[PDB]
Amino acid sequence: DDLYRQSLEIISRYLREQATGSKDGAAGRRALETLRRVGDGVQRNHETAFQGMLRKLDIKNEDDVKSLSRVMIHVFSDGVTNWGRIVTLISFGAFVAKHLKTINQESCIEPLAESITDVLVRTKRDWLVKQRGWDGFVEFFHVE
């Protein structure tokens, strides 16, 4: 399952960079560079809402992800799928990861990343395949 594995790496790496403030083929690298630019921008422009969403979420710890998975499924339950919703969910994942690290500097981002990746890949498998996976993400968010 190359798609699952590729998606978890991109999403995990972003969340870890965001939470820790450190950055460590070329297709995955383009995806991560796109996600940094777009994801950082979502967070910057939606600071107030993300703060409100975080408050409501009331996440207890690094493993407390079932509520977020329910949120993500509910997001798509109107039958619309698009990259803006997808990157927004990942950006909020990053925003949550930063908060977890604040309360406990030893928290791991993996349960969150895995939770988000599971929703996207499992529930939107064929949509992602038709988009040519992360190549579609890169293309959609391509700016000159």
């Binding site: 409501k56 949120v71 997001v75 990259w83 803006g84």
Partner: peptide
């Protein structure tokens, strides 16, 4: 309702972001 409120917010932002880049 909290989970629905969060979802409503995330959807609004996601559709706004989608529109911005699609235009």
């Amino acid at each position: 309702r909290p989970e629905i409120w969060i979802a409503q917010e995330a959807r609004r932002i996601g559709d706004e972001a989608n529109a911005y880049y699609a235009r």
